[PDB]
Every structure is written in structure tokens, then in C-alpha cells.
Design a binder for this molecule. Structure first.
Ligand code: CA
Ligand code: CL
Length: 255
């Protein structure tokens, strides 16, 4: 529960005052453009200190993440920000000494754009290991689309697409159960945890298994010659249930 508190606290990456590096960078750049070496040097320290704060928040988030793969991207992304920082400062100092230097202007701009992109990659990486909310909203978007492709495949008698779409649904559904289950080991018993876990079990033990059997039966029938008849309604019903199930896990995790 304390780590869960630290997590939310660390959610201060959502534009934090002391973790904010884009504004200090625009200011450092403007001093560079106006050719003010002293101003640059002053703002360079502020920019570097917030980048260091941002990095510190990211490393900390990594220490309370069992997401071994999310954590690697964060660490990698952090180390690249670290290497990039002094190079941005030197492009500013260079421009500060030669403000009319067009090359110094172009380099500043390329470093600025590179910093913005790298800061975005890091913050999204830290968002991923401190909240599965985004993950679930995306998972839900993909499930709906894949379920819809699965039913169109049925209507177009596309056995390949049926098996392929059903494989993507099953794998995404299985990953949702895994990402939610573990995440639940950060809370204590209550009507919350239980509702999330009952939603997850209904998906894995009841919904997924019957969707699988309907896919199997559709393929078996469509692979006939002529196609052997079938109940498209049970198939449609079972595929929709996959979406309902994932959507319910998401609602539960949110409350
Ligand atoms: Ca993201
Ligand atoms: Cl995730």
C-alpha cells in the first residue's frame, strides 16, 4: 500500500513543476538566441536540475515495478535523456556565443526537437509502469476491433481470418488478465479487489473458453464441402461476450 502511495506520488510526471523540462528549455533557448551567455548558463542549471528530477522520478518508479519489460524501457529512455541533456546545453551555449550563426540555430532546433521527443518517450514509459489504465483502454479498443474482424471473417467465410483474429483476441485477452491480476497485488481485500478478480476469472474460465469453442465450430463447419450449416447467433453472442468481459475488467479496475 505504501508503494501504491509512492506510485501515485510519482504520477507527478504529468508535467510536474520541478520535473518540467520543456519550459526551462524554451527559456534557455531564448537566452541563447538573444546571445546571452550568462543567462544561458543560469537557465542551463535549472534545465539540468529538472531533467535530473525527472530522471530520479523515473528510476524510483522502476524500483516498485514488477513490470520487467516496462522498467527496461524506462531505464533505457532515462539513460538516453541523461546523455542528451548536456548536449542540449552545449548547443545553447554555442548559440549564446554566436546568435546569428545559422548553423548554431539549426543545431539548437534539432536538439530541442530531439529533447521533446525523448522526454515524451520517457514520460509515456513511466506512465505505463505506474498505471494500467492506458493499457486497458487500448486493450479494449483492440478487442472491439478484433472481435468485429472476427465476425466479419465469419460472414465472409474466411477461415484464415477467423483463426487469425481469434488468435489475436485470445492473446490480448490473456495479457489483460495477467496485467490486471498482478496489479491487484498492490491492494488489500475489499469489494474492489474481489470485483476485479471475479471479472477476470469470468473472462478466463468462462468467456474465453466458450468463445474458443464457437471459433473452432465455425472453422470446422466452414471447412466442410459444402460448408456445414451453423448458428451465427451463438458465435456473435460469444464474441460480444469477449468485449463485455474485457470492458467489465476495465470498469472494475477503475471503479
Ligand atoms: Ca502511452
Ligand atoms: Cl502494461
Amino acid at each position: 500500500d505504501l508503494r501504491r502511495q509512492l506510485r501515485k506520488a510519482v504520477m507527478d510526471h504529468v508535467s510536474d513543476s520541478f520535473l518540467e523540462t520543456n519550459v526551462p528549455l524554451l527559456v534557455l533557448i531564448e537566452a541563447a538566441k538573444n546571445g546571452n551567455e550568462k543567462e544561458v548558463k543560469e537557465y542551463a542549471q535549472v534545465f539540468r536540475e529538472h531533467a535530473n528530477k525527472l530522471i530520479e522520478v523515473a528510476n524510483l518508479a522502476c524500483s516498485i515495478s514488477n513490470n520487467e519489460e516496462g522498467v527496461k524501457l524506462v531505464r533505457m529512455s532515462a539513460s538516453q535523456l541523461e546523455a542528451l541533456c548536456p548536449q542540449v546545453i552545449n548547443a545553447a551555449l554555442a548559440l549564446a556565443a554566436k546568435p546569428q550563426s545559422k548553423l548554431a540555430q539549426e543545431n539548437m532546433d534539432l536538439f530541442k526537437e530531439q529533447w521533446e521527443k525523448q522526454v515524451r518517450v520517457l514520460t509515456d514509459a513511466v506512465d505505463d509502469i505506474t498505471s494500467i489504465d492506458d493499457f486497458l483502454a487500448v486493450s479494449e479498443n483492440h478487442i472491439l476491433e478484433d472481435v468485429n474482424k472476427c465476425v466479419i471473417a465469419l460472414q465472409e467465410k474466411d477461415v484464415d481470418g477467423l483463426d487469425r483474429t481469434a488468435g489475436a483476441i485470445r492473446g490480448r485477452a490473456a495479457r489483460v488478465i495477467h496485467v490486471v491480476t498482478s496489479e491487484m497485488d498492490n491492494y488489500e481485500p475489499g469489494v474492489y479487489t474481489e470485483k476485479v478478480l471475479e471479472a477476470t476469472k469470468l473472462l478466463s474460465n468462462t468467456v474465453m473458453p466458450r468463445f474458443t469453442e464457437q471459433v473452432e465450430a465455425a472453422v470446422e463447419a466452414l471447412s466442410s464441402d459444402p460448408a456445414q450449416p451453423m448458428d451465427e447467433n451463438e458465435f456473435i453472442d460469444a464474441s460480444r461476450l469477449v468485449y463485455d468481459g474485457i470492458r467489465d475488467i476495465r470498469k472494475a479496475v477503475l471503479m
